[model samples]
Target: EYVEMLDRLYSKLPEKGRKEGTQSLPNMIILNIGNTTIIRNFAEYCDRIRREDKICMKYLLKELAAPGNVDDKGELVIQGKFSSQVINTLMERFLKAYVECSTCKSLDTILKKEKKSWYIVCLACGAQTPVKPL
Candidate 1:
């Protein structure tokens, strides 16, 4: 019903305004709109498939709260100098850990979509999981 109302109101909008309004839709809603809907639907539909087939799906954010170190034969490597790419990779691993762990699979079923952001949640465990942007 709401979508119908939106469509009726949208039809009355100027072409440029309608274009602008469509651009502002949530990722989920935008997937079902007009000619571009095919591409969007395909992508989101793939997401659902990937979730069913893949081992894990999650996103991570890290903070520099502590310093880590590695030692190589008498030489000490300080973690502070680690590259950004390394940090990003490590964060990815952390996010996938929950889903990847065998004991946690049962708790990974409920992935809720975010209300105001491009994030999702694991309702089973109440974990805030996020997906990679396409």
Candidate 2:
């Protein structure tokens, strides 16, 4: 059953992101409201990666040492000032940890929970690696 499921997922894997003519993903839009920085288009970026934006945002908030949440408008609302560079750095880290496949360096991966641990299962290369808590 697992093998068949994996096969279906593998067939749906996207072409490599590093290939020519492929546009790079957009960076997050940072908007400041007093001391708080809102990540506008936060959900859009996560959607491009085909992952859970809320989980990604939560990880970003923790890594930035900032208190934040998804607003009613679906933007990431962080209760502190942050630069685009800082946000980008944390986002890249999140992609490395949760999205990208370690073996093929592809973004065709899915997060799966098995028992008590999370794993990054790559559909492109069939690589499975354990992931740390988000």
Among these predictions, the greatest TM-score belongs to 2
What is candidate 2's lDDT per residue for 17-102, written digit by digit as tens? 44222112444457777657676655334433325446554555655555554454666666653535554554454444444435
lDDT score for residue 100 of model 2: 42
Error of 1 at 16 (Å): 21
RMSD to true structure for each model, in Å: 18.7, 11.3
State the displacement of the C-alpha of residue 81, model 1, in Å, after optimal TM-score superposition.
2.2
Give the runs in model 2 whose Cα sits over 4 Å from its true position. 1-24, 32-34, 45-76, 81-87, 93-116, 123-125, 130-134
10 residues in a row with least lDDT, candidate 1: 52-61
lDDT of each: 0.32, 0.46
All candidates: TM-score? 0.18, 0.36
The lDDT leader among the candidates is 2
- Give stretches of model 1 more than 4 Å off: 1-80, 84-95, 98-100, 103-105, 108-124, 127-134
lDDT of 1 by residue, 1-134 (tens): 12222432222233433331111112322221222122232222223322322322211113222353333344323233233333223333333334434346455543333334534544444556445566
Model 2: clashing residue pairs? Answer: none
